[PDB]
């Protein structure tokens, strides 16, 4: 259930919260919508397991 942000254009300023779910422009050539092996989702999940 605990998600974290992984993809962003730059380092966020101190005490700044970024919850934008928009697709990051990861690749050199921009790709818009969904994803392939490029423009991947900026949110990943912790695999917290006992």
């Amino acid at each position, epitope marked *: 259930n605990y998600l974290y942000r992984l993809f962003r254009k730059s380092n966020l300023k101190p005490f700044e919260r970024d*919850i934008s779910t928009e*697709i990051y422009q990861a690749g050199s050539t921009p790709c818009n919508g969904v*994803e392939g092996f490029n423009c991947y989702f900026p949110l990943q999940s912790y695999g917290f397991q006992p």
Partner: nanobody, 115 residues
Framework: VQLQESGGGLVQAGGSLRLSCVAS????????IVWFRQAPGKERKFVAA??????AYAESVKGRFTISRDNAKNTVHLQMNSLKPEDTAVYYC???????????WGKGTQVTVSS
């Protein structure tokens, strides 16, 4: 204050489902939804997110879905088309507000599909 996810009945391959995530709140239009996918005992994944102006799907549901918004109701809804038996998962839906970071995670709905 909270989110409840209801739906995910028994359907056939290629059929259409209507899953709604009604939210207890008053500004859920600002709280854009994100849909998440978990396999039955395997690793988790996301599905889609109608983040206001535009949308973003996943590789498994690329364009096959018609994500919808109910801004006059502060509720979100996903349209399921071209359903496959390999998409037997438990879809989720979540939204985090811009102010005072917080989560309104739901419960889940079965996506069992026959083959």
């Amino acid at each position: 204050v909270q989110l409840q996810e209801s739906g995910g009945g028994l359907v056939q391959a290629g059929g259409s489902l209507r899953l709604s995530c009604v939210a207890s709140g008053r500004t859920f239009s600002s709280l854009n939804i994100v849909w998440f996918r978990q396999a039955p005992g395997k690793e988790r994944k996301f599905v889609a997110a109608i983040n206001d102006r535009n949308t973003a799907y996943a590789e498994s549901v690329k364009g096959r879905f018609t994500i919808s918004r109910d801004n006059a109701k502060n509720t979100v809804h996903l349209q399921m088309n071209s359903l496959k038996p390999e998409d037997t998962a438990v879809y989720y839906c979540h939204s985090a507000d811009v102010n005072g970071g917080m989560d309104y995670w739901g419960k889940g709905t079965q996506v069992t599909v026959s083959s």
